[PDB]
């Protein structure tokens, strides 16, 4: 089997990305934000506290004939951002761009933070990390793919993210003619639970490229591409009035600068971000203060190649036996 699926984003400055997922019988479709760097499929559900629902649509299992309580399964989640979710579990159907999983653990929100309320695009979040960071409890949930994985033709799914535009996500196969060049698989540590990997250098602008490997985890759910102070330093060295600011939380550059590109190595292969993928916008309505996409990790533990780095390339997330990770140009 196969599925295909769009992704949007949810607003002019590609915060995150919304795919539509088909939950229960008959479905309810949710617009869930597709996030390879955790493992809980989760929702706004009938469920969730009433004054923590603004605008989302929300699944209703007691209107579904195959959803069924999970006895005893809780979860309860809190994501590098600050936000957090909690609930209880169901099982049911649950169908992404025509594939469809049997069984799947749907963990319906009893809470959530306030910046999940604030966003009325978002319904829920669809892990596709490995299942060891699963959050339910007392028995660990498998995520989507974990469970669709024996039924796909290949056991991978793609990540194709747009620039200001849709894009796909495609499970059980690789769509040749989404990318050019040749992809370039490079080696996973699933020891953090994440798709986590090395890269092999860097370039700023027409710079020259710096080998020097930057361990890493490529997170769908992250907008921004998190690096070493160093690494960042070197970046917004090159544009003109560009700071770190304590108060706005980051480097912020003048909104009337041209960025340059910035490369990240591949093995021996390039993936080229355009400049203008990090641009992120006033820092507030009106300011000529823009906020950055390349953002120091040094307060993170960890560095985030998110959507600002993912959005450039074709990416395959290879859950073969021994899990790897493909790159290429687009």
Same mark, same amino acid.
């Given at each position: ?30 617009? *869930? ?12 559900? $009938? ?21 069924? *309580? ?30 469809? /999983?049997?069984?799947?653990?749907? #963990? ?23 299942? +060891? ?22 056991? /991978? ?38 798709? #986590? ?22 997170? +769908?759910?992250?907008? *921004? ?7 960042? $330093? ?38 080229? @971000?355009?400049?203008?993928? @990090? ?20 307060? @993170? ?30």
């Amino acid at each position: 089997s196969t599925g295909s699926a769009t992704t949007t984003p949810i607003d002019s400055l590609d915060d995150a990305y919304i795919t539509p997922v088909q939950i229960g019988t008959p479905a309810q479709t949710l617009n *869930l934000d597709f996030d390879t760097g955790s493992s809980d499929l989760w929702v706004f559900s $009938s469920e969730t506290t009433a004054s923590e629902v603004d605008g989302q649509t929300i699944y209703t299992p007691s209107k579904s004939t195959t959803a069924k *309580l999970l006895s005893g399964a809780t979860w309860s989640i809190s994501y590098g951002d600050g936000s957090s979710s909690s609930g209880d579990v169901y099982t049911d159907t649950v169908s992404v761009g025509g594939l469809t /999983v049997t069984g799947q653990a749907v #963990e319906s929100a009893k809470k959530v933070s306030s910046s999940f309320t604030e966003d009325s695009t978002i319904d829920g979040l669809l892990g596709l990390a490995f299942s +060891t960071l699963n959050t339910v409890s007392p028995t660990q949930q498998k995520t989507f793919f974990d469970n669709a994985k024996a039924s796909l033709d290949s056991p /991978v799914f793609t990540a194709d993210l747009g620039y200001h535009a849709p894009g796909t996500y495609n499970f059980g196969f690789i769509d040749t003619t989404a990318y050019t060049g040749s992809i370039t698989y490079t080696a996973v540590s699933t020891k953090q639970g994440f798709w #986590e990997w090395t890269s092999t250098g860097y370039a700023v602008g027409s710079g020259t490229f710096k080998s020097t490997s930057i361990d890493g985890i490529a997170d +769908t759910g992250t907008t *921004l591409l998190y690096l070493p102070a160093t690494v960042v $330093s070197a970046y917004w060295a090159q544009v003109s009035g560009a700071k770190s600011s304590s108060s706005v939380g980051g480097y912020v550059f003048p909104c009337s600068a041209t960025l340059p590109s910035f490369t990240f190595g591949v093995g021996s292969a390039r993936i080229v @971000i355009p400049g203008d993928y @990090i641009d992120f916008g006033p820092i507030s309505t009106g300011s000529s203060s823009c906020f950055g996409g390349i953002q120091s990790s040094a307060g @993170i533990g960890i560095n985030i190649f998110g959507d600002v780095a993912l959005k450039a390339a074709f990416v395959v997330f290879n859950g073969a036996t021994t899990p790897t990770l493909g790159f290429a140009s687009k």
